[PDB]
Amino acid sequence: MNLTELKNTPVSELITLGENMGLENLARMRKQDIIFAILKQHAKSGEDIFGDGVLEILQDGFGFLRSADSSYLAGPDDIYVSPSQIRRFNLRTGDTISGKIRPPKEGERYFALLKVNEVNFDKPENNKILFENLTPLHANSRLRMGSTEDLTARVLDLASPIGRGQRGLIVAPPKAGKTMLLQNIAQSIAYNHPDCVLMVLLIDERPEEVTEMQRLVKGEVVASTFDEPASRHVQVAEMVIEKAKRLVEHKKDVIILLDSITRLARAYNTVVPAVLTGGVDANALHRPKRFFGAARNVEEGGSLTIIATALIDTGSKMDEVIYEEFKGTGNMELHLSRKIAEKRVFPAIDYNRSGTRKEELLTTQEELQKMWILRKIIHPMGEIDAMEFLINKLAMTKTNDDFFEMMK
Numbered sequence: 001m002n003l004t005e006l007k008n009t010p011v012s013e014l015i016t017l018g019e020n021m022g023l024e025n026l027a028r029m030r031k032q033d034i035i036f037a038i039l040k041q042h043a044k045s046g047e048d049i050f051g052d053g054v055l056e057i058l059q060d061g062f063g064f065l066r067s068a069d070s071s072y073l074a075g076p077d078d079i080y081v082s083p084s085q086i087r088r089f090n091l092r093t094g095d096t097i098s099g100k101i102r103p104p105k106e107g108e109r110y111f112a113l114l115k116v117n118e119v120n121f122d123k124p125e126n127n128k129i130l131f132e133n134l135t136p137l138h139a140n141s142r143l144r145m146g147s148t149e150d151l152t153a154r155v156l157d158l159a160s161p162i163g164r165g166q167r168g169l170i171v172a173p174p175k176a177g178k179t180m181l182l183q184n185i186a187q188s189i190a191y192n193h194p195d196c197v198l199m200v201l202l203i204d205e206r207p208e209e210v211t212e213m214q215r216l217v218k219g220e221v222v223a224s225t226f227d228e229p230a231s232r233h234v235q236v237a238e239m240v241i242e243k244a245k246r247l248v249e250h251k252k253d254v255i256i257l258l259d260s261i262t263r264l265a266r267a268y269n270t271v272v273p274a275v276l277t278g279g280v281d282a283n284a285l286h287r288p289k290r291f292f293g294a295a296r297n298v299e300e301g302g303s304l305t306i307i308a309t310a311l312i313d314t315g316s317k318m319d320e321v322i323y324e325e326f327k328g329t330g331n332m333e334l335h336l337s338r339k340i341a342e343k344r345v346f347p348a349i350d351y352n353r354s355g356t357r358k359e360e361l362l363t364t365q366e367e368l369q370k371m372w373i374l375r376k377i378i379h380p381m382g383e384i385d386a387m388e389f390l391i392n393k394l395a396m397t398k399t400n401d402d403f404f405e406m407m408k
């Protein structure tokens with residue numbers, strides 16, 4: 001009946017499902033062939049075959065429905081979308097489409113979208129592109145993030161209040177909680193705000209860190225591994241950034257947690273041809289910024305917030321330039337100290353450095369000035385000295401109870 005349902009169902013059940021349809025000795029062909037031999041077997045004319053995926057409009061004019069469970073990698077069972085079909089529905093890259101499909105004829109190799117049933121979870125007859133939505137500052141509606149796990153999220157909401165559509169930069173040296181901090185936020189996202197579309201974008205990562213991230217996050221984890229070509233890291237990022245844009249057009253609040261705007265920019269640099277300023281062609285930093293530029297609150301409805309990590313102190317001067325450029329382009333930054341972490345001390349947040357632009361719209365005066373008197377007393381406190389102060393002042397309350405009960 002359904003392609004993605006079939007490839008998800010184990011091979012053993014796939015054999016015993018095909019055999020009941022008169023398919024002989026399926027045990028001697030791969031899972032892939034079995035699925036094709038089953039969906040094709042619905043040659044019982046007028047028997048419905050379905051498929052789903054996220055659309056990628058190719059160069060020539062045609063398109064394909066890429067699958068999320070592959071990080072939108074081009075597979076042998078993508079669903080072909082006609083250049084004529086796109087015209088009939090005004091389709092775009094990032095659109096999530098589903099519906100009736102049919103098997104490849106002779107001379108064909110892929111399934112083709114026979115009938116459109118849904119476009120971005122909306123009826124096909126349904127949108128001004130994110131490219132022209134008006135952009136309020138984004139601070140209007142806040143996103144707060146209780147036990148021991150809520151330790152980081154607590155210091156996080158005090159240091160850098162997040163908003164609906166924040167351009168957030170997470171500065172980090174190696175070994176500082178960079179992963180666990182993101183996994184803490186991603187845990188605080190689905191737990192407190194399930195009404196939001198969470199996407200975690202991992203570029204140039206290790207397959208194990210990818211699968212451990214894929215395991216922990218309630219939401220769509222999309223990733224490209226270290227081995228894959230530079231054009232691949234770009235492809236994954238552009239499939240995702242456009243997917244978000246189409247979802248905000250339907251007035252959704254979308255959150256993207258990018259692993260490394262640093263790693264993504266290294267990729268674009270080698271994909272964008274041809275002017276040098278320290279290894280990186282200065283004209284290549286544009287496309288990574290275009291990605292980072294989408295982060296906004298939309299007045300007419302919805303939002304896109306991108307909290308991306310910036311890698312620093314790696315030993316490559318290129319990695320420094322990437323940071324130098326995106327410095328200030330974000331309306332929220334959170335710094336991790338190499339010392340507050342490597343001294344076996346939790347959230348390596350350098351409090352004084354971390355902050356968000358226009359805190360006032362994200363927080364009422366009673367809740368805002370609460371952070372101001374707090375900052376004033378913490379300001380002159382050292383890097384590691386200031387942190388352990390907050391760890392112990394908070395491990396004795398909830399969060400709001402702090403001024404309410406640490407004033408005497």
Ligand SMILES: Nc1ncnc2c1ncn2[C@@H]1O[C@H](COP(=O)(O)OP(=O)(O)OP(O)(O)=S)[C@@H](O)[C@H]1O
Nearest residue numbers: 152172173174175176177178179180181184346347
């Ligand atoms: N929220 C947290 N709670 C407890 N321990 C943490 C937290 N964040 C980081 N750590 C510790 O700090 C170390 C950091 O490792 P990761 O979570 O992989 O961070 P990372 O900075 O992304 O590491 P790299 O540079 O990718 S090898 C881990 O061994 C953890 O024990």
Ligand SMILES: [Mg+2]
Nearest residue numbers: 178179180209
């Ligand atoms: Mg990491």
